[PDB]
Enzyme design. Sequence first.
Site, PDB file in Angstrom:
ATOM      1  N   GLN B 194       0.854  -1.183   0.000  1.00  0.00           N
ATOM      2  CA  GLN B 194       0.000   0.000   0.000  1.00  0.00           C
ATOM      3  C   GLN B 194       0.893   1.237   0.000  1.00  0.00           C
ATOM      4  OE1 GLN B 194      -3.219   1.541   0.530  1.00  0.00           O
ATOM      5  NE2 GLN B 194      -2.318   3.476   1.262  1.00  0.00           N
ATOM      6  N   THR B 195       0.428   2.303  -0.633  1.00  0.00           N
ATOM      7  CA  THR B 195       1.155   3.556  -0.648  1.00  0.00           C
ATOM      8  C   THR B 195       0.342   4.701  -1.226  1.00  0.00           C
ATOM      9  OG1 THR B 195       3.072   4.786  -1.470  1.00  0.00           O
ATOM     10  CG2 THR B 195       2.333   2.984  -2.845  1.00  0.00           C
ATOM     11  N   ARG B 196       0.643   5.898  -0.738  1.00  0.00           N
ATOM     12  CA  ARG B 196      -0.007   7.102  -1.216  1.00  0.00           C
ATOM     13  C   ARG B 196       1.125   8.065  -1.543  1.00  0.00           C
ATOM     14  NH1 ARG B 196       1.129  10.544   2.912  1.00  0.00           N
ATOM     15  NH2 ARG B 196       1.483   9.419   4.877  1.00  0.00           N
ATOM     16  N   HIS B 200      10.715   5.166  -3.765  1.00  0.00           N
ATOM     17  CA  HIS B 200      12.149   5.332  -3.974  1.00  0.00           C
ATOM     18  C   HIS B 200      12.818   3.968  -3.837  1.00  0.00           C
ATOM     19  CE1 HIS B 200      11.428   9.557  -3.998  1.00  0.00           C
ATOM     20  NE2 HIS B 200      10.789   9.457  -2.847  1.00  0.00           N
ATOM     21  N   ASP B 290       3.487   3.291  11.573  1.00  0.00           N
ATOM     22  CA  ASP B 290       2.455   4.318  11.531  1.00  0.00           C
ATOM     23  C   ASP B 290       1.656   4.161  10.233  1.00  0.00           C
ATOM     24  OD1 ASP B 290       2.267   8.019  11.732  1.00  0.00           O
ATOM     25  OD2 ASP B 290       0.819   6.462  12.311  1.00  0.00           O
ATOM     26  N   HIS B 291       1.394   2.917   9.856  1.00  0.00           N
ATOM     27  CA  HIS B 291       0.637   2.625   8.645  1.00  0.00           C
ATOM     28  C   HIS B 291      -0.653   3.442   8.626  1.00  0.00           C
ATOM     29  CE1 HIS B 291      -1.670   0.215   5.689  1.00  0.00           C
ATOM     30  NE2 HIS B 291      -0.503  -0.270   5.298  1.00  0.00           N
ATOM     31  N   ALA B 292      -0.895   4.094   7.491  1.00  0.00           N
ATOM     32  CA  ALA B 292      -2.088   4.907   7.276  1.00  0.00           C
ATOM     33  C   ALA B 292      -2.335   5.934   8.375  1.00  0.00           C
ATOM     34  CB  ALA B 292      -3.323   4.004   7.094  1.00  0.00           C
ATOM     35  N   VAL B 330      14.580  -0.727   5.104  1.00  0.00           N
ATOM     36  CA  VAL B 330      15.974  -0.815   4.678  1.00  0.00           C
ATOM     37  C   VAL B 330      16.592   0.569   4.600  1.00  0.00           C
ATOM     38  CG1 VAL B 330      15.401  -2.767   3.159  1.00  0.00           C
ATOM     39  CG2 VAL B 330      15.433  -0.453   2.245  1.00  0.00           C
TER      40      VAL B 330
HETATM   41 NA    NA Z   1       5.820   4.179   1.374  1.00  0.00          NA
END
Ligand code: NA
Lengths: 510, 510
Positions: B194-196, B200, B290-292, B330
């Site tokens: 998941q990502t908003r 990178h 701190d997901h979402a 990482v």
């Molecule tokens: Na991210």
Amino acid sequence: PAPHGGILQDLIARDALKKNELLSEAQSSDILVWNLTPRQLCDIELILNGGFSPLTGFLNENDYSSVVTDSRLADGTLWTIPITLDVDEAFANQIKPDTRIALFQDDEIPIAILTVQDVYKPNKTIEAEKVFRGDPEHPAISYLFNVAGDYYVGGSLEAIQLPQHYDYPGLRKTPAQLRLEFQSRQWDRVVAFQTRNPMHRAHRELTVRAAREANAKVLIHPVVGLTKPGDIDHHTRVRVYQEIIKRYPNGIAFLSLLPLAMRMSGDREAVWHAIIRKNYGASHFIVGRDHAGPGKNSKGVDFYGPYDAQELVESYKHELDIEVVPFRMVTYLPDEDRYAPIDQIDTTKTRTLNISGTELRRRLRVGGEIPEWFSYPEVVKILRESNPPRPKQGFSIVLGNSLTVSREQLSIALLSTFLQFGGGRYYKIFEHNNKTELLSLIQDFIGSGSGLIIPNQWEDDKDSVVGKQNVYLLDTSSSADIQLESADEPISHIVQKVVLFLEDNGFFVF
Amino acid sequence: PAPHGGILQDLIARDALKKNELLSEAQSSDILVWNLTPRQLCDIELILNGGFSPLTGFLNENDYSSVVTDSRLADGTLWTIPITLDVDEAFANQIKPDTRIALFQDDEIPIAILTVQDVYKPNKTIEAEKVFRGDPEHPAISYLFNVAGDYYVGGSLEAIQLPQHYDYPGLRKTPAQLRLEFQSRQWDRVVAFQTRNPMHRAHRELTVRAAREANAKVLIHPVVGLTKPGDIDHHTRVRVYQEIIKRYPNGIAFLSLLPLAMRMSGDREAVWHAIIRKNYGASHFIVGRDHAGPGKNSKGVDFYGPYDAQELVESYKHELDIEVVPFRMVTYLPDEDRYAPIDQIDTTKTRTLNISGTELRRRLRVGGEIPEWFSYPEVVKILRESNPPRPKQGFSIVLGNSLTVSREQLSIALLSTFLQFGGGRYYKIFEHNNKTELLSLIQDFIGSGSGLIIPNQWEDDKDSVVGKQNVYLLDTSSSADIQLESADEPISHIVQKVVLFLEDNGFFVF
Ligand code: NA
Ligand SMILES: [Ca+2]
Ligand SMILES: [Ca+2]
Ligand SMILES: [Ca+2]
Ligand SMILES: [Ca+2]
Ligand SMILES: [Ca+2]
Ligand SMILES: [Ca+2]
Ligand SMILES: [Mg+2]
Ligand SMILES: [Mg+2]
Ligand code: NA
Ligand code: NA
Ligand code: NA
Ligand code: NA
Ligand code: NA
């Protein structure tokens, strides 16, 4: 449009609930097995996935004969290329009509069960003449006589699974799958482009103009089964397609691979390609100059006339049920920094540039520059990698039978000498001892860029085992690539002759 | 795994044979219409395409209440975020249970017919506290009070079509579609990311390691509906994803866009994301630090603890039915030219480099270099384009109300002066006359890189209409960005003050 014959014969879907049953039968002890040849795998995948609708098996003699002379199936359905299961006599004799046999891949993977309708020995001279035009040099006739079995087994197919492929799982869309991909994007006008070659700027330009004129989305459908002998491998080609597809405007193009086995049968094949693309869901198709033609024979004569294909497809226009977009090849205008349809410019009044295949091949062989107006740099980078220039090419030096100097010392001298030069090429004095298991490794080493020094020649009944690319004979004979002044020429002189020969040919650069 | 609740509630497929009938009803003269808000379009697309299985409509009060306090639907099904149709009083009053209403998009496209089960006015203080933790600054609470309607309409949905989108038609896969895409590639272990945000090198590295450890293929599932306020636009982001997906080893990753409307509801949302990805066909999912979560509030305090999400998802592990892969961030090791899990290196014993968002933002604002170990160059090129550095940024100079010099002459002086400088920025003396139709154009001009000179200020009851980015007030007052020494300062002096201010801030470079 609707599939040729009206129904998509997707046998994989048809037989979904018999997969275990069929799989079990294929693995029975009593069932007669046939290992599919590489071309038959290409054909059965297209039959099983509906790519060849209305075909549902390999052609029996009744249909085959109509295809040979009438260009149609016995029911009158347009069908120009015979698709048959060619076997040898030993196997043909073990089978009679109604016999159910299993078709395997690699002697281990069951593909389908074929219910034999007939077994027959076709007159390959007629097929050769009627279907492929008769020139003994036509790749289809060569295959027809030298590779294909002498007996055709006609019969209905039941599907177990499509031929296994571990590369490009994402891109090998079946007819049903491709149709759903278009449907999910709401594409209902799609122009398809056939190719067995790398695509350069011109191909990108011409396909986009096609899209603009037909008001259709673009389908780059390259062949990745068997194409023309000498063609660039499909891995290299797929890399190029994946690269060029990124150069279209977003959302206008889709890349899907076709596991077809081309026959290079010119106009007949062009018709066949139209039918096949219609089955895969295309509404439009471009037929090119000498489409699917193998070129010229030894006498330099055309296997097909440049417009036979377009003319034949046009004659079947009212029953093909897929629009054929006119082929407008484009050329580059230096002075205007653009490509334009060749039929729009005056050769003697306007400057045009282009790089023939021959010239492209040369540039690649010598590591020369290739301009961005011809092909995108990322595409050229890929071609240079699969086909490296001479300083990066492997080669072999075979010490001829005429040599009376010490073979062990000449080989050692060559090795020590080559090792002085830089460049990273790996060297090996390779003894094959006329053993096939070793001879077959020669081109692998050369393909790896390596330099091999082979102390003695292999027997003539072994030539076939060794590819002749970049293999050079050092001998007194006239047919030697590096001719010795005499059989006992001093080793140091011989070494010089070899070094300077390899330099003249670009393998070494100082 | 199987959809949450056991059945994929793909209402588009369920109602395929009622599409014309429903479409006709939605277009009837007597039916009551509701225009869906942008967030409701995000939610209804996920309900209609089964993304929110088992939901089949907007929550009635019975279910909604259980979700608010119990984190479950009244039937006990885990469901942490309430999805309701919020309307204003005027509309709520026109409807009673059993009433069938039509849900439109852009006041012209019928999406669905909703059969009203109930109408109710929820206590937004409880929802705010219970679901979103209560901080008035939580974006969900802000929306809850300032944007969302005060009345919830609960009811069952029937599908006409999913919300219309003309961009990225190829990438917006529905649950059923994505499941078929995995199935055609024989993928049965898929880890979703998941990502908003832009991705990178670190994100590429961590997702691939995830794939390696879970023995799964990778699904980059970015949110493209509503995400956090201030986030980078999804067009820019999609461009970045399409770019980075090319950096995975061939055949390991798939890019699909998710039209979700995030609530930035931390741990509850993390659970919701797991459920949603399970419906889309993923077998695994990564829950981050701190997901979402929306971060910290004004007082600098955390809206959620960094591990609340992972802990909450872990507490529901036995009923989520989707494996959660541990989050191993990482970092880059200069001395070894590689990335390694942060939990494996000793901060005080080993060198590590990284670029925070703040620093990345700075570099982009000043056109500074960004190293390839941080982000791939093609990805950085895209970010620089959507967010150009100051020499390429637009701006506005507002002549304050305190000015007694001639506004017409000062504006002309500024124009003539700016026009001397190079750089290609376009300039305009812009008169809005306090008209909204003109004021709303200010940020468009600035967004276009333009330099605007605005002769006088607009009324305070209009501030809201104009974005404040790169808008500077020239005034004697203390709250001015470019403070005048006095109201009658000589025009040439004022001009200098402005030029040097813009230079100090990077808009002009000499
Ligand atoms: Na991210
Ligand atoms: Ca024979
Ligand atoms: Ca010719
Ligand atoms: Ca002698
Ligand atoms: Ca309110
Ligand atoms: Ca913190
Ligand atoms: Ca004064
Ligand atoms: Mg296959
Ligand atoms: Mg949509
Ligand atoms: Na038709
Ligand atoms: Na071509
Ligand atoms: Na001809
Ligand atoms: Na399960
Ligand atoms: Na906590």
